[PDB]
Amino acid sequence: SNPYQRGPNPTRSALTADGPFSVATYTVSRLSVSGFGGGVIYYPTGTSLTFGGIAMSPGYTADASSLAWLGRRLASHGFVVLVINTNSRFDYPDSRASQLSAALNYLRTSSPSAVRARLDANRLAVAGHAMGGGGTLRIAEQNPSLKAAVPLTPWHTDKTFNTSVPVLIVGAEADTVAPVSQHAIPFYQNLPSTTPKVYVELDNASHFAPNSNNAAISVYTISWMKLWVDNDTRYRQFLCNVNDPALSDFRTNNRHCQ
């Protein structure tokens, strides 16, 4: 028995819509925290259970609202999700990494009572869009206790990240901002061969696909987080032996499948 398992047995259909957990929100004002720009927490309500936590970063010039759908989506499948605002909307990837670190520490140590009651502080993960995805890669190198990292259409000028944290990268085939040939693909390639890694490429999608409801992003991000944050092997089936017409590519070293 897995004490971290949550929710009914999954179907792919179910992972393309909000899940079985009711979601509450808490707006973190900029003035209330140090080390990051506040943000929005999406968390389960109507439950006595605890769940893993995820800190998520938007990209350059964006605010937390650009990943509201995904914060809600993940929370509704059983996670405490803090989508940050950054100190400045212009902050670069390695600044966003520091701010994700501050946000995780905030969840663990000074988050509101109703949020903290729902969190298992031992089980944390990161995700982020674009420069926020570069930040995700960098904090994976800095914090080996993280359970998982999901860079979405990531951007970074550095290409090699030395992490043991399981990484699933989402690229967008037609991304012209963080082109996959220069960003997502090199990131995937250059992670250690011994780290569980997946690359999923959205067919004919733009850089901004992560900023609105997206079935593929939903399936893969929920599944990776479930597998690693919750040890929930019921989600292997969506990540192994993949054939998804929403994707123009799927690559892995298959370390997650057994």
- CATH number for 99: 3.40.50.1820
Half-sphere exposure (CA, 13 Å, Cβ side) for 40?
16
Residues with Cβ within 8 Å of 39's Cβ and at least 6 positions away in sequence, in order, are: 28, 64, 82, 83, 84, 85, 103
- CA geometry: angle 96, 98, 101, nearest 5 deg: 110
* Nearest CA-CA partner of 173 in 192, 211, 199: 199
Half-sphere exposure (CA, 13 Å, Cβ side) for 245?
0
Contact of 224 with 148, CB cutoff 8 Å: yes
DSSP 188: H
Give the method of determination: X-ray
CA distance 232 to 217: 18
CA distance 187 to 173: 15
CA distance 67 to 69: 5
> How long is the chain?
258
Q: Could you give the residue ranges of the DSSP H alpha helices within 18-155? A: 68-76, 93-109, 113-116, 131-142
**Resolution of the experimental model, in Å, one decimal:** 1.1
CA distance 177 to 138: 19
* E strand or H helix at 55: strand 51-57
The phi and psi torsions of 55 (rounded to 5 degrees) equal -105, 130
Structural domain range at position 41: 1-258
* Tokens 């960098």, residue located: 138
CA distance 104 to 80: 11
- CA geometry: angle 69, 214, 167, nearest 5 deg: 90
CA distance 78 to 81: 9
Q: Could you give the residue ranges of the DSSP H alpha helices within 23-92? A: 68-76
Contact of 130 with 177, CB cutoff 8 Å: yes
* Tokens 């909307």, residue located: 89
CA distance 5 to 59: 31
Number of structural domains found in the chain = 1
Contact of 93 with 131, CB cutoff 8 Å: yes
* Nearest CA-CA partner of 63 in 211, 222, 179: 211
Measured between its terminal Cα atoms, the distance across the chain in Å is 17
Quickly count: other Cβ atoms within 10 Å of residue 107's Cβ.
21
The phi and psi torsions of 126 (rounded to 5 degrees) equal -135, 150
> Please, is 155 exposed, middle or buried when counting C-beta atoms within 10 Å of its C-beta (0-12, 13-18, 19+)?
buried
DSSP secondary structure of 190-258 = HS-TTS-EEEEEETT--TTGGGS--HHHHHHHHHHHHHHHS--GGGGGGTSS---TTEEEEEE--TT--
* Nearest CA-CA partner of 121 in 135, 133, 106: 106
Query: What is the C-alpha radius of gyration for the chain, rounded to an integer number of angstroms?
Result: 16
